[PDB]
Amino acid sequence: MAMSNMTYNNVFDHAYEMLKENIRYDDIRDTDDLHDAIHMAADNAVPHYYADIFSVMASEGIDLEFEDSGLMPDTKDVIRILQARIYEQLTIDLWEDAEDLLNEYLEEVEEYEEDEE
Amino acid sequence: MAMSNMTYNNVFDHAYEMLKENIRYDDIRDTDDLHDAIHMAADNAVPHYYADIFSVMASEGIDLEFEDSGLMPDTKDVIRILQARIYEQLTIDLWEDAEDLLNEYLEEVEEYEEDEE
Amino acid sequence: MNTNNIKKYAPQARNDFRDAVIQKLTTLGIAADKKGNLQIAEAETIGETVRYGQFDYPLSTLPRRERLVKRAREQGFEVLVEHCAYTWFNRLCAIRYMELHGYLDHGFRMLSHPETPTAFEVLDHVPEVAEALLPESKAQLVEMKLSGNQDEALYRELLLGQCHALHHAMPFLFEAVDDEAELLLPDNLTRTDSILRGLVDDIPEEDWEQVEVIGWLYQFYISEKKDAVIGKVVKSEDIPAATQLFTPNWIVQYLVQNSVGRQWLQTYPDSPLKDKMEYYIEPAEQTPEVQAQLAAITPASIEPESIKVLDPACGSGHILTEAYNVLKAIYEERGYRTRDIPQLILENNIFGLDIDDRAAQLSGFAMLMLARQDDRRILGRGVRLNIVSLQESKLDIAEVWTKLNFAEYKLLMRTLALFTSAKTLGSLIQVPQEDEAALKAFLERLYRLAVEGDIQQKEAAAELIPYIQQAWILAQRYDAVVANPPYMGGKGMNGDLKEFAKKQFPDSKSDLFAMFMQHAFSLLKENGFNAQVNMQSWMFLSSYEALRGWLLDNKTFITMAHLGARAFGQISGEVVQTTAWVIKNNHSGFYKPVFFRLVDDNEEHKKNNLLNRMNCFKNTLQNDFKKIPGSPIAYWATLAFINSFLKLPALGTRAVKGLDTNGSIDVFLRRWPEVSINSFDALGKGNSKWFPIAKGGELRKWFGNHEYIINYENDGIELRKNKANLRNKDMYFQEGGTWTVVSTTGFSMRYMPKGFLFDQGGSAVFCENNDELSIYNILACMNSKYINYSASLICPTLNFTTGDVRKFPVIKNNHLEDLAKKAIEISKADWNQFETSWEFSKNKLIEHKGNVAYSYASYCNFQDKLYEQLVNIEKNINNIIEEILGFKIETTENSELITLNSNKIYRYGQSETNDTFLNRHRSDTISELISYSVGCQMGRYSLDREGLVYAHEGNKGFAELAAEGAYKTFPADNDGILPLMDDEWFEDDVTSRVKEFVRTVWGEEHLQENLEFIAESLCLYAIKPKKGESALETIRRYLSTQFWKDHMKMYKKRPIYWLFSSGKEKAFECLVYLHRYNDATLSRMRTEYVVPLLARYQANIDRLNDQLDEASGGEATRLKRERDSLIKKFSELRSYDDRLRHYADMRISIDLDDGVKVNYGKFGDLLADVKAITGNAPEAI
Ligand SMILES: C[S@@+](CC[C@H](N)C(=O)[O-])C[C@H]1O[C@@H](n2cnc3c(N)ncnc32)[C@H](O)[C@@H]1O
């Protein structure tokens, strides 16, 4: 009920898998198109259960201070701020290592192009 | 450590004991002078370990929405906001029951006049 | 940390050497600007000296400077810099390695001194070294030692004397006569800031004990440039820098021991060499016919001096060492003097080639060091090594072929025109076999003239030797070719290289290692072996089908090891899978190879498994690979599967591709909820503009994935103006099957009804007009274990294309049709129970009667019934098929997964958390009920009729529909605006109408019990429980806190009900229906929703503030806190009213034909979450 054990690593793995799914489905070919592909990948990664959110912030791998002042919601609820922090951390981590999947997909599609036939 | 089980009830009990000790030490004999006593009691009651704060916020007895917009800190850290929320909740809960202690102390100290001897 | 020293040292050493050489060149009078053109200054001869710029030299360096200048103009400045730098680096490393082992004659260290740091051991025993190296000047050198100065000059003189002595032993690295490099040697070699200090003391002392340090130096010296030049189109000059690596030893031993040792053991079956080799693999078993053929073709006796080994890419020279070891063992077994073996081995058993000079130098040095490890009289006798580097032949000097002399001219001119571009192609050039003896004789004549003759003849011979030597090496037949081909795909496509590849290698033009394989086969002799290691992507791909077809009917497989990933010491290559193989040059169709499967392990585990010989498959002939379509090399299959694959028919031309728009999908594609249903073709006939399209999504079987529409008005005139293929025009608007092309989990096919289009991503299958088969039978066959296993085996990449699907087997039966029909019905019934489908009819809970708990229990029972029924149905399909073909198929991966929303595992994840899943399901169901109630209030649905009631544009025709009597049990709102606040001030409050809805549906007697049940259910997962509050308070808190987020998540950032919010404090919030918005909407909102609220706030502030001033109390601070927030609310509401009044003056007209994304940004900062939907920050006025 009020007890849960979810770590940041599970969230990161889920986000990584969803990013791979998005880049495969949408047929991303350029780096600038990755932004949105990352954004959606983060959207379906932040938990909505309050217990899970509180357990994630106590895990290892996520800091407790914002880096950009433009990503803080102007609200009175504390769930939104924590969700925004998780979203920013996931965005940074995913964008840190993202060209690998893009170039792998590009080389694979080049291999199986079969002379455009 | 991380596996910390600290609830809002323990914090409330500690704050109540501190308030009783402060009102006994200071010897306040008026209803409208309890603001300083309750402020002092509430200040030295919130924890500082981040794991304790995250375990308290997920406990039973404290909500997740601010009631006053003027108590929101202006900072980029998330521990400060949670501490302010806990402080406000404790202040409201303790100010709910504050006249009983004052009148009990007054009626108890009334019985030690010794006819000015 | 052992290799970490070399890793940290090598690139810095390269940079320092390059800096020193460029500084020396600039001081000499040669420089290059930013652009790159040379800055060759004019030489001035003042007299007795020279005047290069502002520097002087004693007139003896003029010819050498001229040679350097003429080299600078004919090729790259950077080329010269790099050549000099790595030449000096290699010379210094060789000197250090040789002097550490004590191979020098005088026995004194040259670059160091024992037990004394920063000291030299040659500055004290000067006379001995002087008489050993340079006797004639010996006495003079002694005088220098008596001077007490000129130490750097003496050391420089002594150091250059070693290279001249070593020139005779290894001519490929050192020179004797004066050369250009002596002018590029840095100065101050004995100071504390020199370049020798890093080499001497930065590397440890124990790292030079082995011989593998050469490979580390070869690999780590070029790492920075390799990392720099990877992500582009690599040109010819950077080819070596991009394809240089190092090979682990056990793989090399496995390759070598199965190609030379195999031949020797075939000739002599009971040799004592069997136990010397530990990676030798014995043949399994053979039929009498192949045994007789092999015995007939096997020779009787062979002499050790007739074995030839070639390495088309020498690199560091790792393979040649193992070949040397095996040949030494053979020679010792035959019986020879131990002092005469290395000479013979190096003379007539080892050959090699490469494209870079650095690799040639390193390979020669390694071979000589290994030879000296077991001999001492060597290095004093002239021995020629047949290891050379290819060079261009763009020189036709008048002096040569005219002064050289004292029939062959035809041969020379024919053979000199083949190497016009040899620094790009490499070893892929072919030389005719018939010109071998003549080339050998000409080379012998050139060798003879290189000693006897005048200066002109000697110079001409020294000029002409390398071309003839490389031609003779390349025009010879060998019986063993071992190599590690370089990898380069479609990025390194130089125009000349790819033109040559397409002209000469049509069947292997897609990469370089395949071309190397074919050329190696062409370079071999009859009955020869070819052993290599390359990447996996040539056995399971359709681009190499011709190569596999040509390879399986002309050669024979002997042995193969399937390494998989994570090999090569995890030196990058995260997506690199490799295999190693040995192939013979003869033909035999009834040979049984031996296969190993080491795919899932670590490097140490793989080595141990190969050493113990585990995971062996040797129960398959060679012709059996031709029975599977596409001829893939699947060694782990069984005979029954292969035999049964050809007993059934396959799909013909029933599979076709979909259309393809060239781009700009944001103007053609929409989701179905966000357009008017009058223009929708699926429902509401009369005018069609949008048509359903199939694109393919997640895994799903027999039905589902209906969530897109496309614009196809007037047969497509807007789409045809753009460059769109529109393939298969005449096959549209028909029923059939569909499947996703690029997937990630498995293969599945779904039913597709009429009125649909299919895209490139999701392709379609259509039955013929009067075909024997039926679509239901095809659907039944395509969703079984057999087809899933076959598809996984054929294409491991999970990229099922139409050509791949055009050869799947099909089975004809009769029960499969009805079973498939039942499964389709069940799946459709499961899919049509949510609001996000245009066939949604009614909510499930309101069908039953009694309590909410009873309805919830019945709903759960219904879902469980559907799930169990489908699970039972899917078993008979598998049972029937396994009786047609007499074998069983193993179950792996997700072959036992039911794709339904009734199954909680499918829709919530693999984790087994049933305690939380029994609360999450309940909370979600109650949330969906509340959403349906809000929809009924708005007017989208109704309690009288089923399906959508009003979804048109502009709120036109709603009055007539309402007056007809569509809503009579539960009336709908007339304005179209629903307030959402924390008081009962308005009559349109959402909570009050929710309570009215609950009272109407489930009666009056148990209203309180139902409200308590709903409030309890909401707090399990959606929100956090509170201490004490009623059901209505919980409902209001849920509506005001977490209803916008759930709605925005359900429709995937394409909301139907738009939220207008005042700001940080909930002063005013409202919901507006998108399909009932016109130009006179904001005016009504301002006129009769905001002004009365402002008046109420003013009155409440005036009333409340009055009573506190009159009477105070101890606990009167609560009223102060209550009154404080009202001022903030009033100010915020006033600001919002001003902004709304500004925006409402312009009569904004919206168009639903455009997307929600475009239209959501026309109202400024009046809505909520503008950035999360539109993608850009709102614009302020
Ligand atoms: C990956 S290295 C292998 C080195 C060596 N086989 C080993 O394992 O230590 C491949 C070598 O092939 C050489 N090479 C690249 N392209 C070539 C070509 N077109 N013709 C001949 N050799 C080439 C490069 O110089 C490179 O050193």
Ligand SMILES: [Mg+2]
């Ligand atoms: Mg209304």
